[PDB]
């Protein structure tokens, strides 16, 4: 009567039952018009007797554990306008008798174990508005031709299913459909041109299929179109100009196709475009200037294409741009200073182009730029002092260019800077002491430059996990303060002019997995403390120095070292200290003064005889039988 969850007809007959969130279990009067048992943690089959409530207009069993088939008897209920079975364990085919529910409006089958094909019978459901069957991994076959008969269709989604073949031309008959979502499925063949007849279409999500052919021109006649996601398919041909005729379109993602041709000038007419992703295609031409008319653009990703020419200056007109990715193209010319007028820019990646000239200082005035990736271009000139103005800079990669002059001291101003790669440039002078002020600096790669001078423990910030100074002119001695960097994992100082002993202070870097001191002027004896860093795992490279004496006995504690290169030194004595290192994959002892015998273990036997020949006394011996 009045009890909670129960509702009554005016004649006093039980009308509706609604039960939710009661954490039950297990399995589960004919005036009843509405039944919701939902989110109850119910198990077992749907009772076959459900078909007996002739007056049911609503059945919601969703958000349970129900198993078994969808009983055919469920389809005896002629007055049913809502069938909600989603989020269960339901298996089997969607029965043909589904076509028997004349006034069905809502059908939710999504997130089940369903299989087989969408029956040809859906065509019979003429009041159907929403059909969502997605998230059934084994729902398979083609979308039937008869789908064109559900004329009231508004929302259709089959996403994350095994649905395959081409979308039927029938689809063009859905004059009311707003959203077609069939994505991350098995779809192949061309998008049918008839899709242009769907005049109410707003969102078309066909991404992550095998769709082939080109993008139909007719899509430019859809005036209500908002989002078009077609990424990661086999799409071919030129981007249709007519797309510039969809006034409501805010999102276009064609990423990861075979598209060729040019970015259409007509895109300038899309006053609502927020997001344009063309990434990973064959698009050629130059970035058209009319694209700078798209005032609301936040995201522009044109990376991995054939685009040529210059980045247009009028790009300053895009005042909402937060993300600009043009990397891996054929872009030439200067990076325009006007790009600094887009004050919202979070990330710029122009890497892998032909860009030349100086880096315009103005770009460093952007207060929200986290990521600046300019790597692999023809850029030259100085790094501007203005680099200090760029307050939120987190990730900076300038590597693989012609940059000249000194690393500007004001880089010390950047307190959020995590990752910096300036490697492969023409940089000169000293690593500036002021860099000690980058509190957040983790990764620092200066390798392959003309950097010179000495190296100070005071100079480096103590949060560094990765240092590569290799291939420079650096000199004097490795500073004792190197021991202050206790986070330091990889340290690569190779191909420098560095001198003196390895300081025992090295021992106190307890995180060090990789140490490359190769190709320097180091001398004296290899310290015992170097064997006290059990974290050494990846590699220890001492080669091409002046080291003398013997391999320190502590080296036996190097139990995690996989690669060791002492080659091209003056080292003497024997190798016995190394015989027990069970994890050592690679040993280069060549061009030393070593002498004595090595056991006949397959390990040592794998050492090149030419490596023993470049020593004093080394040879493999055979043990005596005793």
């Amino acid at each position: 009567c009045n009890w909670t969850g129960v509702k009554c007809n005016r004649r006093g007959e039980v009308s509706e039952i609604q039960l939710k969130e009661k954490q039950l279990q297990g399995s589960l009067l004919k005036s009843l018009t509405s039944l919701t048992l939902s989110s109850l943690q119910l198990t077992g089959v749907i009772p076959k007797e459900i078909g007996d409530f002739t007056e049911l207009e609503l059945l919601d069993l969703s958000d349970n554990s129900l198993s078994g088939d969808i009983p055919v008897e469920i389809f005896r209920l002629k007055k049913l306008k809502t069938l909600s079975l989603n989020t269960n364990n339901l298996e089997g085919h969607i029965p043909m008798e589904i076509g028997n529910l004349s006034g069905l409006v809502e059908l939710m089958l999504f997130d089940n174990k369903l299989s087989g094909e969408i029956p040809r019978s859906i065509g019979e459901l003429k009041n159907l508005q929403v059909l969502r069957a997605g998230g059934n991994k084994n729902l398979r076959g083609e979308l039937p031709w008869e789908i064109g008969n559900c004329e009231n269709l508004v929302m259709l989604g089959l996403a994350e299913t095994s649905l395959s073949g081409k979308l039927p031309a029938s689809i063009g008959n859905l004059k009311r459909v707003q959203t077609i979502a069939i994505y991350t499925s098995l779809l192949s063949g061309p998008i049918p041109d008839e899709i242009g007849y769907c005049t109410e279409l707003q969102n078309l999500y066909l991404y992550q299929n095998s769709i082939s052919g080109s993008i139909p021109t007719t899509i430019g006649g859809l005036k209500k179109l908002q989002s078009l996601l077609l990424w990661q398919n086999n799409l071919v041909g030129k981007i249709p100009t007519e797309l510039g005729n969809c006034p409501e379109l805010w999102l276009i993602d064609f990423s990861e196709n075979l598209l060729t041709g040019t970015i259409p000038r007509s895109f300038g007419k899309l006053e609502n475009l927020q997001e344009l992703q063309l990434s990973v295609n064959q698009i050629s031409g130059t970035i058209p200037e009319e694209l700078t008319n798209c005032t609301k653009l936040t995201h522009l990703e044109i990376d991995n294409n054939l685009i040529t020419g210059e980045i247009p200056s009028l790009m300053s007109n895009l005042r909402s741009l937060t993300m600009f990715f043009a990397w891996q193209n054929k872009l030439t010319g200067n990076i325009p200073q006007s790009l600094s007028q887009c004050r919202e820019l979070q990330a710029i990646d122009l890497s892998y182009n032909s860009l030349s000239g100086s880096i315009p200082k103005e770009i460093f005035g952007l207060r929200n730029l986290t990521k600046l990736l300019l790597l692999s271009n023809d850029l030259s000139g100085f790094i501007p002092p203005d680099i200090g103005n760029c307050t939120n800079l987190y990730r900076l990669r300038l590597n693989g260019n012609r940059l000249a002059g000194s690393i500007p001291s004001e880089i010390g101003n950047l307190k959020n800077l995590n990752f910096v790669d300036i490697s492969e440039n023409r940089l000169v002078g000293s690593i500036p002491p002021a860099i000690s002020g980058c509190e957040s600096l983790e990764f620092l790669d200066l390798h392959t430059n003309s950097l010179s001078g000495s190296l100070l423990g005071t100079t480096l910030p103590k949060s560094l996990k990765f240092i590569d100074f290799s291939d420079n002119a650096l000199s004097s001695t490795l500073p004792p303060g190197i021991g202050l960097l206790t986070e330091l994992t990889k340290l690569n100082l190779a191909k420098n002019r560095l001198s003196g002993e390895i300081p025992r202070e090295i021992s106190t870097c307890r995180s060090l997995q990789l140490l490359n001191l190769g190709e320097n002027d180091f001398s004296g004896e290899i310290p015992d403390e170097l064997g006290q860093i059990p974290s050494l795992a990846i590699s220890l490279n001492l080669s091409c120095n002046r080291f003398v004496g013997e391999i320190p006995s502590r080296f036996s504690d190097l139990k995690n070292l996989g690669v060791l290169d002492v080659s091209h030194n003056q080292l003497t004595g024997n190798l016995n200290v190394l015989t027990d290192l069970q994890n050592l994959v690679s040993l280069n002892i060549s061009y030393n003064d070593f002498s004595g015998d090595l056991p006949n273990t397959p390990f040592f036997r794998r050492l090149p005889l030419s490596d023993l020949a470049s020593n004093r006394g080394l040879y493999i011996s055979n043990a005596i039988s005793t």
């Binding site: 999504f110 979502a181 999102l251 890497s351 892998y352």
Partner: peptide, 13 residues
């Protein structure tokens, strides 16, 4: 739940 619709995840260097 099957994923919500999404765009191509952007990649940078």
């Amino acid at each position: 739940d099957y994923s919500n619709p999404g765009h191509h995840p952007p990649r940078h260097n």
